[PDB]
Amino acid sequence: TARAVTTCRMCGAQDWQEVVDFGPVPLADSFLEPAASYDDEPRYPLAVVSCRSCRLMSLTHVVDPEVLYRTYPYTTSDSETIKKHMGHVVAVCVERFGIPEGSFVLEIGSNTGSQLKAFQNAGMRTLGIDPARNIAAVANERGIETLPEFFSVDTAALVKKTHGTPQLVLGRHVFAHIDDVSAVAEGVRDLLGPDSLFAIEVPYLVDMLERNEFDTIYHEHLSYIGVGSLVALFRRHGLRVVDVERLAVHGGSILVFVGLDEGTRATAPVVEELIALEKERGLYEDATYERFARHVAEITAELTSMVRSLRAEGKRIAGYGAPAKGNTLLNVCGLTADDLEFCCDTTEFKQGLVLPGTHIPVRSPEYAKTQAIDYYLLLAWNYGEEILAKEGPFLADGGRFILPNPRPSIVPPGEHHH
Numbered sequence: 001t002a003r004a005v006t007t008c009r010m011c012g013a014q015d016w017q018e019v020v021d022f023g024p025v026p027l028a029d030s031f032l033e034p035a036a037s038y039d040d041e042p043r044y045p046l047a048v049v050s051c052r053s054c055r056l057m058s059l060t061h062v063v064d065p066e067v068l069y070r071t072y073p074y075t076t077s078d079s080e081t082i083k084k085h086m087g088h089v090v091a092v093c094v095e096r097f098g099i100p101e102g103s104f105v106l107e108i109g110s111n112t113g114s115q116l117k118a119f120q121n122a123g124m125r126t127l128g129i130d131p132a133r134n135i136a137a138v139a140n141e142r143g144i145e146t147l148p149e150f151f152s153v154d155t156a157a158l159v160k161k162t163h164g165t166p167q168l169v170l171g172r173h174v175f176a177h178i179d180d181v182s183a184v185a186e187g188v189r190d191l192l193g194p195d196s197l198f199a200i201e202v203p204y205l206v207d208m209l210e211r212n213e214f215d216t217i218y219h220e221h222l223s224y225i226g227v228g229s230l231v232a233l234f235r236r237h238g239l240r241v242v243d244v245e246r247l248a249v250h251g252g253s254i255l256v257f258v259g260l261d262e263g264t265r266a267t268a269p270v271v272e273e274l275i276a277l278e279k280e281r282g283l284y285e286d287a288t289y290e291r292f293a294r295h296v297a298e299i300t301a302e303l304t305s306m307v308r309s310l311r312a313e314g315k316r317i318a319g320y321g322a323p324a325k326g327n328t329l330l331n332v333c334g335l336t337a338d339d340l341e342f343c344c345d346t347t348e349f350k351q352g353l354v355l356p357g358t359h360i361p362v363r364s365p366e367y368a369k370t371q372a373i374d375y376y377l378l379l380a381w382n383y384g385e386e387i388l389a390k391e392g393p394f395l396a397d398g399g400r401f402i403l404p405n406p407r408p409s410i411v412p413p414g415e416h417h418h
């Protein structure tokens with residue numbers, strides 16, 4: 001079973017409002033072999049709450065990280081969107097903060113090592129930390145040194161002893177996956193020198209709310225983060241937020257830079273600005289989260305009826321992509337193999353398997369091209385630009401996409417915009 005949350009991860013208070021509850025839901029990255037029955041498929045409570053002190057949004061429960069990550073199926077995206085963005089991460093970290101060549105970059109949640117490879121090509125030393133043993137072994141084989149463990153205070157000490165003081169510690173879409181964020185901040189403080197930086201990239205709570213990105217809620221994502229809550233945490237561990245860049249990736253994200261409170265790095269005015277913008281946008285008020293809750297109910301209702309109405313007219317519908325978030329979407333909406341006949345996915349591992357809960361088949365893009373699909377529900381919507389750019393033939397044949405946010409809509413639109 002999953003361990004229930006008591007006190008807030010960031011600020012340590014215990015006062016939260018309920019925002020939305022999806023009940024028991026299977027794990028989003030637990031894909032299954034095709035079978036006759038799925039009676040013993042595990043399901044865990046999926047519900048979110050909002051801490052009134054610092055306004056961290058969090059799940060009510062914490063699924064065991066040993067269960068989630070020790071055999072992880074998701075390798076870092078090989079898309080042009082992520083290749084480009086990884087290059088941009090290097091550029092921002094190096095040029096904005098003046099990190100010299102030959103400097104040491106440690107990455108938490110380094111996965112296959114693609115992001116570290118980009119730092120190596122820019123002239124840096126690297127080391128990765130990732131508990132996914134299968135994925136860690138690939139990174140190591142490829143020449144990118146990765147410790148096959150979770151980040152911790154003692155792993156941080158091992159790194160300092162064996163590899164030294166890093167100029168940069170990086171965590172991309174891992175910080176919201178960790179329960180004991182307090183221990184992460186502590187290991188970071190010990191690791192950082194006076195001008196070292198800790199950088200985390202996470203989905204931005206502001207974008208999540210304004211765009212109704214409820215499908216990004218799943219068990220791996222324990223936290224849903226705004227800048228305010230991060231300041232509340234780092235305050236308590238001798239750390240200080242010095243810079244933030246807003247990013248279009250993964251539905252709107254923030255790349256946050258953190259240094260030692262008594263260190264070289266001055267605080268940029270942008271930090272105060274975003275904290276003021278979060279207040280200004282109603283993040284510290286109960287109404288905003290009840291508004292989010294009904295938006296979700298409306299979108300869920302509208303998405304299901306849109307799909308079932310089209311099917312009733314004799315239209316064929318499939319899913320485009322089989323991302324983790326897609327599985328939250330389809331389970332909450334209650335869609336099945338009768339509504340979507342398959343989900344196409346470029347991930348070889350996922351091909352020939354079946355989605356969690358809904359049990360919809362995952363097929364290859366080359367199979368998908370043989371089938372006369374009328375509509376694709378765009379589950380991998382965070383790659384919307386790249387996907388639409390290469391689906392000209394489908395679109396020219398009268399094919400259409402259904403996008404789930406900010407509001408459900410049909411691509412192509414009825415008119416050109418401009």
Ligand SMILES: Cc1cn([C@H]2C[C@H](O)[C@@H](COP(=O)(O)OP(=O)(O)O[C@@H]3C[C@@H](O)C(=O)[C@@H](C)O3)O2)c(=O)[nH]c1=O
Pocket residue numbers: 074077079173174220221250320321322323324325326344345346347380382383386387
């Ligand atoms: C761009 C593209 C993706 N895909 C597939 C590959 C992937 O399985 C899926 C996209 O998954 P995506 O990268 O959005 O990630 P998700 O599977 O949604 O989530 C993973 C793990 C999660 O913990 C996290 O933090 C985020 C950042 O990453 O869609 C295609 O089939 N065709 C495409 O053209």
Ligand SMILES: Nc1ncnc2c1ncn2[C@@H]1O[C@H](CSCC[C@H](N)C(=O)O)[C@@H](O)[C@H]1O
Pocket residue numbers: 065069072074075076077108109110111129130131132135149150151171172173174177178
């Ligand atoms: N406590 C922890 N310490 C280090 N890595 C962790 C962790 N918990 C989860 N992870 C790893 O973090 C990754 C989350 S997915 C993000 C992968 C990569 N940074 C990318 O953006 O593509 C997984 O590889 C998972 O194994």
Ligand SMILES: [Zn+2]
Pocket residue numbers: 008009010011012013051052053054055056
């Ligand atoms: Zn809090």
